[PDB]
Paper text:
To ascertain whether structural divergence drives HPV type specificity, we scrutinized the crystal structures of L1 pentamers of genetically close or distant HPV types. First, L1 proteins of HPV33 and HPV52 were cloned and expressed in E.coli, purified, digested by trypsin, and crystalized. The crystal structures of HPV33 and HPV52 pentamers were determined to resolutions of 2.9Å and 2.75Å, respectively, with refinement to Rwork/Rfree values of 21.0/24.0% and 18.7/23.5%, respectively. Both structures show a hollow lumen in the central axis, and two neighboring monomers intertwined by surface loops. It should be noted that the surface loops in the non-crystallographic symmetry (NCS)-related monomers within the asymmetric unit of HPV33, HPV52, and HPV58 might differ slightly in conformation due to their intrinsic flexibilities. Then, five L1 pentamer structures representing two groups (group 1: HPV58, -33 and -52; group 6: HPV18 and -59) were aligned to compare the structural differences among their five surface loops. We also observe that the surface loops of types within group 1 or group 6 have quite similar main-chain traces, with minor differences noted among the loops between the two groups. Collectively, the structural information suggests high conservation of the overall structures of L1 within a phylogenetic group of HPV, which even extends across different groups, despite minor variations in the outer antigenic surface loops. To explore the feasibility of including more genetically close genotypes into a single, chimeric L1 VLP type, HPV52—which is closest to both HPV33 and HPV58 —was engineered into the lead HPV33/58 chimeric VLPs, H33-58HI and H58-33BC, by individually swapping each of the remaining four loops with those from HPV52. Further pairwise comparisons of the surface contours of wild types and mutants illustrated that the most distinct bumpy protrusions between parental and targeting types were located on the side-chains of K53H33, N57H33, K59H33 and K60H33 for HPV58 vs. HPV33 (bottom left), and K380H52, S383H52 and E388H52 for HPV58 vs. HPV52 (bottom left).
Residue numbers in the entry:
A (entry chain A): 20 to 54, 61 to 178, 184 to 408, 442 to 476
B (entry chain C): 19 to 408, 442 to 478
C (entry chain D): 20 to 55, 60 to 178, 183 to 408, 443 to 475
D (entry chain E): 15 to 55, 60 to 408, 443 to 481
């Protein structure tokens, strides 16, 4: 029914290079600063970077010789054969926190009876998140999963849970150790997780669903490296919604310090441990020899999506400005800010391909994505989504050895 | 009267089929089930117990190939032969991110911290239980077979004969073999034992196992079974270390003998020995991508036993333990909306989700039913011949039933694990 | 001149399998418990013990072979050779802990220890620890030999430092492995009984004298060995008691009374060990080991129809907490419960043996008589009874049908 | 055929025979105190200082092969040739279990813990020294040569044409080379320096090095020596991390300049800066079997330098550092037996033991003494020719191993000899 592109896409020996040059974004690691207009965007090492790469239409490309294909019966398309995801900045680890995190007691070694909550025991705590590197390559944007609030099927009842699929947009937050969930709707107090995710949605890639799509336009390939361990053991203030059933313990004696049980609403903090050079997924070329799905790297619609998560460069810079210059130090004379910067350099190598548009081939392409034939001459549904637009229309070059990944292609292949 | 490889009487065809379960989901409470305590019956389960520390035991049901609508049935003779599926490939898919969950007890029997400083004063009192938590021993495993897997655990034994029997004597210990069901608890760092009967206070281990049985797979026994129906193969990866050093309140049942220490001087803080009922807390350390046993295909080339991947009775069992995704989600609902924060305005809940996708590749097999072969199969399992036309003892057990009757396909390259098959075998 | 057994022992193509079936022992991890007077009700069973199995093989010269035409009983004798071995281990991976309710720890000397305070009369504390992690297995036809430090000859005041002497001995089943405090006779070299935890504080901790076993001429003790040890220093303490060797004055500028420092604190430091993580990938057991070429001249020949398997495996040292109810009441009271500790070790020994023949010429009979005269005497052509071994009888357990058993299917592939 | 103006590999003038010999030391044992020697209280030693943090420098003495009782002397011509041993294999045997010892100082100059909380203020006072201990940087190494190894360490330099230096000024530093002797201390995490001269208070490092020199091998220098007699080969495995963050008491000699901070207020806790004389404690982390350099044979195929394993002067030097078996044993003796425990009734001691077994395989070589060779060897070391008939190292301390009466041709009678006959593809004579 669905076939590999190898049966209807003819490969040429024409290769082209394209590079984005330096890409930079600088912002605040925890929240955007709105003063709804954005003066400082939210820029964090815990964000998905989803690049929408724009390719020149090869059927309208200023080819110097157009005698290799026949516009009467054939059309051109680019296929991706190589990719290098460049990363600037040193390796480093950032930290996130909440000035009013709902931590009550430390339950690791010493938590004797007793001490009941009271009105507000929130504390000012921070942590380092779960370490994640990942890259996804495809010609349609990737699909993630997260837990959201279900249908009502009472005030303070546990919300029903539902697994949600969505397109991963640029700026979405990756999971951090507290799971892939919509914190804005499932944590009402805004105090159970750090402020950079407490009103955000944390998404994890739906690798299983993307792998099982028939055409395979979302996942040509992927790399991932996750790690975390549990750094501290806490519990929550607030009323325990699901009290421990009586058959799981012998109750304490009345008129005894143990006769009202403490909350078993435990929660861990995560930690990503070390970041290392030898673990890097980036700054090294990856050659697509054979995709996992039926789309063997064909960039339908003359576009390509590169999804990147890299927490190994998440260092948040401390900036300090002087309010009044005086001969002795006073805290009131200085203001403290946080800024984060991410640096990328996307390099690609593309292969020119031609498609003979017989009767059977045009039917198959129409069933796959009718917009492919309509664009070939033989509004955009993604405009509601947020992507980092990379325009490579005028960036194609045929002289590969002028550029880093092209010199590597002329050797490594 | 000799057990032989299934290769001696089962012929392989070149017919291969793919089957996939699609996404499998369960959501629940990581420590205990919630069962309509007020306003109804005890049995009525509103929220099941779902924890990354549980066994997932899938009973996969295959369509009967002798009744399957094959497009060409000229490869075998129903007059003299019967068909059976063989497992050649398997991918255990896992959704959800890697993560680590935490378990605890609001009244855990921890007395003193015995790691660095534990000076003499020493007598516990009536109730010194604390609200403590911990992260468990990390375990990954997968076992594949056509009969359910067998575990081991320690249970209360029977007392020596003509031997009493005073209350509070140390319980007799007995190693018990049993079938591992879906929802059984894996060992967590405190061993494989029946905590319900061997720990009477209900307070010596966290609440998600303190009334459970924690089982460990009896790999040795499954391997030494003559036919090898429980163990086609297995992968396992365990790790833990000791994070903290505690001791117990309560009377020390076996006092330290006097030849092992010089007693302290009376009228001195050392005149009554502290409890040497020590216990550690475990810790599973990091979870990493490179350690994963899952999300990658495994091909049965040669099973360890005599059953070389033959799925007798058109069923197969896939056993999984995966604590590398045990993150417990914190849910918080608002009781009253107010302009300032008050603890009494919010309720805290815990929920855990497990995501699976099981993919298989099966090879069609035919069996010529000669006189010796029917005799052999009858000794092995007479119910095999009865089903072929030539109640179920597993109905008391709990399995995650996966019905693949309507899920078999001959178009292998339409599916992920099938495209991968077409590269490996070179077909 | 000692020669390899390859020069006078002929190999046949006859192989046999033998398995012990499941082996279980349960006990108290720290000490044995006696009756009601002299009796072991609960043995001392600990993940820190050597397990030394004495495997008894059927005499092949008296064995009921289905075919006895491969050798000449007038001029030849039979003996077994070990070619394969799988040391099965049940029970989950885990770490147990040991301690002492009256451990001689004084101060924590890691980070903060200011000069305030004269030691006193009795400062022992109730502390525990995780031991150094050790896996090993040694295979031979004579029991293995260990090393440990013991009390020497005095050559003499009472509190003087005991003289040290390195002592060799046979490693018996139930002996304690080194734990991080060294291989020494703690019963004699630590008089207070409080400097190390109670499960070794009156025991002898032995380490295998690998150097001596390898350099013995016949090589009957060590066909091969595997070992994997690891530990780090978890805490830094010092001792109470009078410091026997005071620090010489040329190593410091003495303190003043205004600093409270004019009496030095005890520099009898001691670390606690820690074995760190136990992992699946580090395991020595539950996988076959094939003897192709032994290290010594005895290439796996089981003289006397016996084989010794020495094992240490601390990676399954979990100590179970058992809790019994004295009185059932509706509320919790500590006095209603008694707390116990139990440990269980599960083994399953599988072997594959190769039948061998020896032509008993005059030279060979001369050589074998020089090596061990009891070999010829038993062929018709026990000083180890004072030692404690886990006896494993395989006389009635040999089978020629190799593929009926786990290690026999694995043998038929490799 | 060997030029006098240039140094050449020994392969150009040393002929190898097919004669191989085994020699083993058997068990080597030393027991002592891990921190200091215990004397007789003029200067006689009752218990030596024995520590896993010491260099073991073995001087192995071989039989002169020109005077050795060979059964058949027809493989060379004593009229025109002389014999010398070449080392082809080595196994450094190590007994005792793996373990880690700890060192300390009852009066260590630690003031505050500067890792997490060190608030203002805190008055130094006259004496704040504490009783602290630590585990040292983990080090394994082995070096083989026919001359003793050369170490490096920092010492007090000479102050020339300038006597205007004040008492308590920072001493001038100078990198010093020396022969590493048996019993010298390896660096522990505080660097390779002469602590006796560069740390005057005697309290800034633990007592087992505070009046010692910690030396590190000058690998770069030994490798660049023309003849290469000190370095046939070497193996090394070092590791450490920072366990604690402390600072020193005493006056800070180099105060932090004012352009590096905004000063505090005079009537405020901050107007006298605390000492930024920081110092870490080290930690060697785990010791593991999989990391061992020893108890495995090492075969010399081709040395890095020009001396390709020739044992000139019929001697060999084996240098070993192994902190992976550094467990210090706790010994406790009873002063008075009483029915109850009293601290005063017991004495606490420390003892450390090191166990070795050195095994070698030597290859016999012959040297045809033509005119060019005699000139070449005379320029290299005239004592070689003089001993052949054709001392200065006794001021240094080495663990002397006499193997004169220990050579054997029956290679397969011995552990390393069996290992040699397999790696060489030989079958026992």
């Amino acid at each position: 029914k669905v076939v590999s592109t190898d049966e209807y896409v003819s490969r040429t020996s024409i290769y082209y290079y394209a590079g984005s040059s330096r890409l930079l974004t600088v912002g605040h690691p925890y929240f955007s600063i709105k003063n709804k207009k954005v003066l400082v965007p939210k820029v964090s090492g815990l964000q998905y970077r989803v690049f929408r790469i724009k390719l020149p239409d090869p059927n309208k490309f200023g080819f110097p010789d157009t005698s290799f294909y026949n516009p009467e019966t054939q059309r051109l398309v680019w296929a991706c054969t190589g990719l290098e995801i460049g990363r600037g900045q040193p390796l480093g680890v950032g930290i996130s926190g909440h000035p009013l995190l709902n931590k009550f007691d430390d339950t690791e070694t010493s938590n004797k009876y007793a001490g009941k909550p009271g009105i507000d025991n929130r504390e000012c705590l921070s942590m380092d998140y779960k370490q994640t590197q990942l890259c996804i390559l495809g010609c349609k944007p990737p699909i993630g999963e997260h837990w959201g609030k279900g249908t009502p099927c009472n005030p303070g009842d546990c919300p029903p849970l539902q697994l949600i699929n969505s397109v991963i947009q640029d700026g979405d937050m990756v999971d951090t150790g507290f799971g892939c969930m919509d914190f804005n709707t499932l944590q009402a107090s805004k105090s159970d997780v750090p402020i950079d995710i407490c009103s955000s949605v944390c998404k994890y890639p739906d690798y299983l669903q993307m792998a099982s799509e028939p055409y395979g336009d979302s996942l040509f390939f992927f790399l991932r490296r996750e790690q975390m361990f549990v750094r501290h053991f806490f519990n929550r203030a607030g009323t325990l919604g699901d009290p421990v059933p009586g058959d799981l313990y012998i109750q304490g004696s009345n008129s005894g310090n143990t006769a009202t049980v403490q909350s078993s609403a435990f929660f861990p903090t995560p930690s990503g441990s070390m970041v290392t050079s030898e673990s890097q997924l980036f700054n090294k070329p990856y050659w697509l020899q054979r995709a996992q799905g039926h789309n063997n790297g064909i960039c339908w619609g003359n576009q390509l999506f590169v999804t990147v998560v890299d927490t190994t460069r998440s260092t948040n810079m401390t900036l300090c400005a002087e309010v009044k210059k005086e001969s002795t130090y006073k805290n009131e004379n200085f203001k403290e800010y946080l800024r984060h910067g991410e640096e990328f350099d996307l390099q690609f190598i593309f292969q020119l391909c031609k498609i003979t548009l017989t009767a059977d081939v045009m039917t198959y392409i129409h069933k796959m994505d009718a917009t492919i034939l309509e664009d070939w001459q033989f509004e955009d549904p993604l405009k509601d989504y947020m992507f980092w637009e990379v325009d490579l229309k005028e960036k194609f070059s045929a002289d590969l050895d002028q550029f880093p990944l092209g010199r590597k292609f002329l050797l490594q292949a």
